[PDB]
């Protein structure tokens, strides 16, 4: 009971975690009681990594006799959704493994292996994350129990692409820790299954070999080293080459292994030679504007930059290739581009000069642009215009991935236009979707899924990396609004998945947070200021910038709502992000206390309100400000901000209703005695029936009233049980 | 000759490839035994060219592949090949073994059965084909031309497997023989045979080679019949315990027998942990019930097993 009281103060110390583990292991009646309390504590944003840390680092000796319960805690904690509990359940397993007896470490590995094989979605991801971290913490002990980890291999058929990558990463890392150059238990058998997987007709089982084999080779890449790796990689390319599904995968799995691990420039320059030739061969043709063959469409070479010479060689072969496949490889175009793109980049220090013509390329395509005049001319033609728009969209989706990092200002110009062509392409893509319904499977896959319409097309896009977000550095215009939103929307979808996808998840969270502070703040601070001046001073201009205004206030919010800012270390990251929000005026002190930085930021964001176009943009601003306060008057400021949202004039759906409840919830919660704000709604709540069944301080109707009253009541009851 | 086959992998199928094949016929042994020894990667693409120059839509290509395959199997297990080369060879075999016609597949898998009789393989690496071989047979339900005909792909598959149960399994390779049945889909009758035969061989192994063998038997049962797998393992040690209790009343033995049982147990408790039906099959098997049984049911070993199972959370209460 002494522990549950302090849940009203979130700062209670580490000794509380140690004591809860002791109480848990005492008797079965305390078990179920503790267990719920521990879950309600973790969902209270309390008992975080930080506390479990100091609890274990100091107290491990005391906790050595509590082990089997600690492991029983891990279990029943692991078995819930809401990863927060699963994480803490995993942090138990790990801190166990860390300081503890062998027999304890034998079961930990076993318990984790099980969660992997028979577990659920999250359970398996989290279990394989800890099993990785265990090798980092203690490898030599990790390898002694490896016999259990191998058992995982037998369950491979049930796993995802992410985890197959995760599982081989572990087994091969163990195999090479034992001895370099030799072959032992793990090495051989994981070579065995890799063979038996590649040789299946069914793609599901090739997926296992293709990923597992490229991962091995990837790890053993750090004369006998290169020949082993090479023979392993060629055995993959011979199995994967017959099906355009498989070969595109192998090219993406190869594109992974090159950008992640740091290999020998001599091993990199070996497998690199084939890639440049293979690519020009399959996809690259000269500028004859008349391609060979009969296509009942006006096939031209479409949308180069035209700053690239009209008289000249290079054009991509898309249509003639995609047409021949349909009637009787062109799906490997994007995958091969990424691979080649990373091969040159890694052998050149990042100079793409040799490939730079690829960003200037047109493609051989029928006009995809409108289907508007051509509407209601369909069947084969409508499935062809959809995927041709699609395939191209992915090309220029991958090309922006290549050249976003390049130095030269002309090279940044060449990307910025691919950004507009990426914008127009995406409008043209959804033109064909709302038109050709439900009969439209794609010709490619995404994130390996399992075996299209509006909702799904989002997922069939390729992956933009965060380096692409460095395009955000430039300004706006009366990089325009259309391209800004395009980036801002990808960012928000990324920061939802991280701080609240493959290449994303395959780099550490910290990196993504560190970069997103630079990449955004002293950019958006400039971008935001342009949006405000605009909303202070047309059909699409409004619609688009009012959206960019949201995506900004959604992104900024997602950064400071980062639940990892509670940790000591992240204070430096926070100090930066907070002081980068510190300039309306200059910085008189370099080291200025966190408390002022909070309010300097807050005030800076508080005036932004009056420019906000929609009821939403007022909400996400509130939520942003509110996440700054949690870092550290301002409570009342928020009220007036929520007051205004329900007050001034604004230009049927649950959206509007839901955001109201979010505002009224913030309004009544942060203000002074609530009776005052409640009477206002009680006195001017009357005008509804009495005028023309709107009000002074409006947004009150049949449907808008019930929303008020719920928040009205609940808050009164909250203050009633308060005293 | 090598390069001239590299040109054929360039221009066109059939006439280019298959013309140069019919001209040789002499020997494929001396070339592969060596051209592997200079650079093993000269053999890798050697197979790719010769194999696509001998499809299954042409008998002269088919009947040649059969001789090719035979020659790729022998060497893998005969000479000492850098595993890198030996693997690559088998990988491509498994790769291209898909479209072999009914007649040839049976002939292929029957040469393994003949090799199983007496061979020093040094490599079960030959046996990696058997799993894919039999599953290819399972894909064709129509009579094949062999013998008297009147047999489907599944039946030959069944009859092929029955022959494998009858022949002597070499003491060295029975780990790999068994792990080969692990990659194949079985009928409930076929399973009890693979399991029972493997069991039948138990008392013919040195004790310490049993524990890893049990684990291999345990991973078969997941798709297979648990009761028998458990029944054999338990009753094998039950009879083995009796002999040890008889020497004690009439140190030397204790270090091996009781250590092995401690390894065997720890394996099947971890198997029950990954697979529950194996645990529920163990309990339903050991249920005392009628009182004549609990005398014949539980023994030192099966009890040590249950106590050890107490570690798993679910079965804890049921066991007690």
- Determine contact, residues A113/A149, Cβ cutoff 8 Å: yes
Chain A residues near residue B91 by CB distance under 8 angstroms = 195, 198-199, 235, 239
Separation between Cα atoms, residue A457 and residue A430, nearest integer Å: 9
What CA dihedral angle connects B266, B269, B270 and B274, to 10 degrees? Answer: 170
Q: Give the residue among B99, B103, B112 at the shortest CA–CA distance from B146.
A: B103
Would you call A300 helix, strand, or coil by DSSP?
strand
Pick the closest to residue A406 from A460, A453, A345 (CA basis): A345
- Within 10 Å of residue A180's Cβ, how many Cβ atoms? 10
Burial of A142 (0-12, 13-18, 19+ CB in 10 A): buried
Judging contacts by C-beta atoms under 8 Å, the chain B residues touching residue A189 are none
Chain discontinuities in chain B, listed by preceding residue (C to N exceeding 2.5 Å)? 250
The experimental method is: X-ray
- Report d(CA A46, CA A39) in Å as an integer: 10
CA distance B293 to chain A (A): 34
Q: Does A277 touch chain B (CB under 8 A)?
A: no
Annotate A265-296 with b (16+ C-beta within 10 A) or e (fewer).
Answer: eeebebbbeebeebbeeebebeeeeebeeeee
Cβ neighbours of residue B161 closer than 8 Å, sequence gap 6 or more:
B134, B181, B186, B190, B193, B194
Is B83 within 8 Å of chain A by CB?
yes
Short-list A71, A82, A83, A84, CA closest to A114:
A71
| B270 lies within 8 A of chain A by CB | yes
Which chain A residue's Cα is nearest to B88?
A235
State whether residue B241 sits within 8 Å of chain A by CB: no
* Minimal-distance CA residue of chain B relative to A226: B84
Q: Whats the size of chain A, residue-wise?
A: 723
What six digits make up the tokens of A107? Answer: 């079961």
Task: Name the residue among B41, B94, B274 with its Cβ closest to that of A199.
Answer: B94
SS3 A316: strand
Q: At what angle do helices B83-96 and B41-52 cross, to 10 degrees?
A: 10
Q: At what angle do helices B174-181 and B188-200 cross, to 10 degrees?
A: 170
Query: Choosing among A118, A149, A195, A236, which should be mutated to test the B contact, i.e. which has the most B CBs within 10 A?
Result: A195
Spatial CA neighbour of A347 closest among A269, A253, A277:
A269
Whether A397 contacts A464, CB under 8 Å: yes
Tell me which residues of chain A, numbers 446 to 485, contact chain B at a CB-CB cutoff of 8 Å: none
Please give the radius of gyration of chain A, using alpha carbons only, rounded to the nearest integer.
29
Question: Cα separation of A7 and A16, whole Å?
Answer: 11
DSSP H or E segment with residue A365: strand A363-365
CA dist., res. A109 & res. A98, Å (int): 12
What b/e sequence results for B274-303 when a residue is b if at least 16 CB atoms lie within 10 Å of its CB, and e otherwise?
A: bbeebbebbeeebeeeeeeeeeebebebbe
Chain B residue numbers with beta carbons less than 8 Å from the beta carbon of A113 are 274
HSE (side-chain half, CA atoms, 13 Å) at A79: 10
Q: HSE (CB half, 13 Å, CA atoms) of A535?
A: 24
Instruction: Report which DSSP code applies to A64.
Output: T
Alpha helices for A99-181 (secondary structure H): 102-118, 121-137, 139-144, 146-150, 161-178
Name the residue among B136, B11, B166, B32 with its Cα closest to residue B89. Answer: B32
Which positions in chain B touch A201 (Cβ < 8 Å)? Answer: 98
Residue of B nearest to A242 (CA): B95
Name the β-bridge partners of A316.
A284, A363
What's chain B's length in residues?
Answer: 320
Name the minimum distance, in Å, from the CA of B313 to any CA of chain A: 9
Residue bearing tokens 């008349």: A290
- Quote the CA–CA distance of B46 and B73 in Å, as a whole number: 15
What SS3 state is found at A315? strand
CA distance A365 to A322: 10
The beta strand positions in A534-673, using DSSP E, are none
Residue A411 sits at the chain B interface (C-beta within 8 Å)? no
Q: Which residues contact A27 (CB under 8 A, 6 or more apart)?
A: none
Instruction: Verify whether the Cβ–Cβ distance A239 to B273 is below 8 Å.
Output: no
Q: Cα separation of A388 and A366, whole Å? A: 9
Q: Which residues contact A546 (CB under 8 A, 6 or more apart)?
A: A535, A613, A614, A617
Nearest chain A residue to B39 by CA: give it.
A227
Structure tokens at B314: 């679910």
**Minimal CA–CA distance to A259: which of A146, A347, A385?**
A347
Distance (Å, whole) CA A537 – CA A479: 20
* Resolution in units of Å: 3.4
Query: How many whole angstroms separate alpha carbon B137 and alpha carbon B185?
Result: 11
Asked if the Cβ–Cβ distance from B87 to A235 is below 8 Å, we say yes
Which of A238, A241, A246 to mutate to probe the B interface, most B CBs <10 Å?
Answer: A238
B94/A235 Cβ within 8 A: no
CA nearest to A460, candidates A474, A449, A470: A449
Start-end of H helices in B167-253: 174-181, 188-200, 210-221, 226-248
b (16+ CB within 10 A) / e for A221-246:
beeebbebbbbbbbbbbbbbeeebbb
C-alpha triplet A405, A411, A412: angle, nearest 5°: 65
Q: What is the per-residue DSSP string for A229-240? A: HHHHHHHHHHHH
Residue A228, min C-alpha distance to chain B (Å): 7
CB proximity under 8 Å: A 341-360 to B: none
Secondary structure of A351-364 as H, E, C letters: CCCCCHHHCCCCEE
Contacts of B88 in chain A (CB under 8 A): 231, 235
How far is residue A650's CA from residue B175's CA, in Å, rounded to a whole number?
77
Question: Which SS3 state, helix, strand or coil, does residue A515 take?
Answer: helix
Name the residue in chain A with its Cα closest to that of B184. Answer: A196
Instruction: Look at B274 and A195 and tell me if their CB atoms are within 8 Å.
Output: no
**Which residues, other chains included, contact B13 with Cβ-Cβ below 8 Å and sequence gap of 6+?**
B52, B53, B55
What are the distances in angstroms from CA A369 to CA A365, A417, A486, A503, A677?
10, 16, 19, 31, 55
Got the DSSP string for A588-627? S-SS--HHHHHHHHHHHHHGGGGG--SHHHHHHHHHHHHH
Determine contact, residues A164/A125, Cβ cutoff 8 Å: no
Q: Out of B85, B92, B270, name the one closest to residue A148 (CB).
A: B270
Residue A289, token pair as written in the block: 């504007």
Contact A422, A414 (CB under 8 A): no
Backbone angles phi, psi at A315, to 5 degrees: -150, 140
Q: Do B94 and A196 touch (CB under 8 A)?
A: yes
Torsion of CA A508, A510, A515, A516, to 10 degrees: 110
- Report which of A80, A79, A171, A91 is spatially closest to residue A130, judged by C-alpha positions: A91
The answer to whether B48 contacts chain A (CB < 8 Å) is yes
Sheet with A284-285, side-by-side order of all strands: A284-285, A315-316, A363-365, A300-302
């Amino acid at each position: 009971k002494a522990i549950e009281r302090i849940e009203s103060a979130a700062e209670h110390k580490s000794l509380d975690v140690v004591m809860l583990l002791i109480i848990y292991s005492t008797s079965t009646q305390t078990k179920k009681g503790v267990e719920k309390l521990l879950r309600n504590k973790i969902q209270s944003d309390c008992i975080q990594e930080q506390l479990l840390d100091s609890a274990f680092s100091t107290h491990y000796l005391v906790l050595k006799d509590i082990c089997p319960s600690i492991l029983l805690l891990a279990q029943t904690l692991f078995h819930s959704q809401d990863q927060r509990i699963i994480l803490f359940g995993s942090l138990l397993y790990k801190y166990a493994f860390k300081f503890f007896d062998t027999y304890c470490q034998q079961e930990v590995v076993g318990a984790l292996v099980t969660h992997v094989c028979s577990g659920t979605e999250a359970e398996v991801d989290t279990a394989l994350d800890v099993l990785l971290e265990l090798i980092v913490l203690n490898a030599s002990a990790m390898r002694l129990n490896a016999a259990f980890v191998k058992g995982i291999l037998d369950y491979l058929e049930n796993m995802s692409p992410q985890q197959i990558r995760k599982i081989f990463c572990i087994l091969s890392t163990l195999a090479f820790s034992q001895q370099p150059g030799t072959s032992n238990h793990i090495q051989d058998d994981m070579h065995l299954v890799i063979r038996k997987q590649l040789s299946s007709t069914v793609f599901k089982y090739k997926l296992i070999g293709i990923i597992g084999a490229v991962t091995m080779a990837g790890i053993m890449a750090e004369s006998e080293q290169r020949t082993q790796v090479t023979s392993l990689l060629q055995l993959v390319h011979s199995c994967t080459e017959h099906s355009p599904w498989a070969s595109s995968l192998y090219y993406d799995e190869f594109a992974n292994l090159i950008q992640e691990r740091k290999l020998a420039p001599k091993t990199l320059e070996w497998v690199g030679q084939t890639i440049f030739n293979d690519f020009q061969d399959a996809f690259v043709v000269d500028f004859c504007a008349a391609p060979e063959g009969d296509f009942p469409f006006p096939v031209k070479a479409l949308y180069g930059l035209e700053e690239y010479s009209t008289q000249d060689g290079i054009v991509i072969n898309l249509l003639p290739l995609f047409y021949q496949e349909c009637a009787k490889s062109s799906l490997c175009l994007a995958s091969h581009f990424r691979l080649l793109r990373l091969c040159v980049a890694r052998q050149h220090d990042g100079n793409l000069d040799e490939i730079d013509g690829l960003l200037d390329c047109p493609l051989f395509l029928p006009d995809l642009e409108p289907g508007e005049k051509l509407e209601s001319m369909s069947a084969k033609d409508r499935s062809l215009m959809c995927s041709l728009t699609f395939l191209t969209f992915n090309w220029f989706r991958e090309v922006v991935n290549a050249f976003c990092q390049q130095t030269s200002p002309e090279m940044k110009g060449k990307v910025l236009s691919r950004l507009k062509d990426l914008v127009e392409l995406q409008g043209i893509l959804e033109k064909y979707l709302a038109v050709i319904p439900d009969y439209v499977p794609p010709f490619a896959s995404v994130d390996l899924d399992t075996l299209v319409s509006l909702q799904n097309y989002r997922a069939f896009f390729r992956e933009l990396d965060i380096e692409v977000f460095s395009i955000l550095h430039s300004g706006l215009v009366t990089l325009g609004p259309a391209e800004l939103l395009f980036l801002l929307e990808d960012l928000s979808q990324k920061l939802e998945n991280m701080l609240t996808f493959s290449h994303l998840h395959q780099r550490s969270v910290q990196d993504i947070v560190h970069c997103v502070v630079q990449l955004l703040t002293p950019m958006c601070n400039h971008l935001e200021n342009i949006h405000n001046f605009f909303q202070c001073l047309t059909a699409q201009e409004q619609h688009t910038m009012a959206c960019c205004y949201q995506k900004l206030l959604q992104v900024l919010h997602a950064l400071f709502a980062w639940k990892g800012f509670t940790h000591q270390s992240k204070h430096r990251l926070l100090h930066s992000a907070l002081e980068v929000l510190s300039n309306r005026l200059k910085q008189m002190e370099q080291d200025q206390p966190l408390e002022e930085l909070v309010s300097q930021s807050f005030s800076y964001l508080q005036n932004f309100h009056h420019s906000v176009p929609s009821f939403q943009c007022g909400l996400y601003l509130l939520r942003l400000l509110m996440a700054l306060l949690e870092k550290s008057q301002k409570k009342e400021k928020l009220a007036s901000l929520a007051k205004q949202l329900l007050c001034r004039a604004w230009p049927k759906n649950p959206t509007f209703n839901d955001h109201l409840h979010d505002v009224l919830y913030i309004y009544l919660e942060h203000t002074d005695n609530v009776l005052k704000a409640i009477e206002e709604i009680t006195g001017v709540g009357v005008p509804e029936l009495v005028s023309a069944p709107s009000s002074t301080f409006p947004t009150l109707t049949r449907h808008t009233f019930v929303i008020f009253f719920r928040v009205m009541m609940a808050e009164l009851e909250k203050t009633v049980k308060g005293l | 000759m090598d390069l001239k086959i590299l040109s054929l992998a360039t221009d066109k199928t059939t006439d280019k490839l298959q013309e140069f094949l019919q001209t040789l016929k002499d020997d494929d042994l001396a070339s592969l035994l060596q051209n592997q020894a200079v650079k093993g990667r000269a053999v890798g693409t050697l197979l790719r060219a010769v194999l696509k120059g001998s499809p299954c839509s042409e008998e002269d290509g088919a009947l040649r592949r059969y001789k090719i395959y035979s020659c790729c199997i022998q060497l893998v297990e005969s000479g000492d090949l850098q595993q890198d080369v030996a693997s690559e060879i088998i990988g491509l075999l498994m790769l291209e073994v898909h479209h072999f016609p009914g007649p040839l597949l049976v002939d292929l898998a029957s040469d393994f059965v003949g090799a199983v009789r007496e061979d020093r393989l040094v490599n079960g690496k030959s046996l990696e084909l058997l799993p894919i071989i039999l599953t290819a047979l399972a894909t064709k339900k129509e009579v094949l031309a062999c013998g008297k005909g009147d047999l489907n792909g599944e039946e030959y598959k069944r009859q092929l497997i029955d022959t494998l149960c009858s022949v002597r399994w070499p003491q060295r390779y029975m780990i790999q023989l068994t792990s080969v049945f692990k990659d194949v889909c079985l009928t409930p009758e076929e399973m009890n045979l693979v399991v029972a035969k493997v069991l039948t061989m138990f008392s013919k192994l040195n004790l310490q080679e049993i524990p890893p063998l049990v684990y291999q038997l345990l991973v078969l049962s997941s798709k297979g019949s648990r009761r028998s797998v458990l029944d054999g393992i338990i009753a094998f040690f039950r009879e083995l315990d009796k002999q040890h209790r008889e020497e004690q009343s009439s140190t030397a033995p204790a270090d091996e027998l009781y250590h092995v049982e401690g390894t065997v147990i720890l394996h099947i408790v971890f198997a029950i942990k990954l697979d529950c039906e194996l645990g529920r099959e163990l309990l339903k098997h050991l249920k005392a019930g009628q009182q004549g049984d609990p005398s014949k049911c539980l023994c030192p070993f099966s009890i040590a097993l249950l106590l050890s199972l107490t570690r798993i959370q679910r079965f804890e209460e049921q066991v007690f």
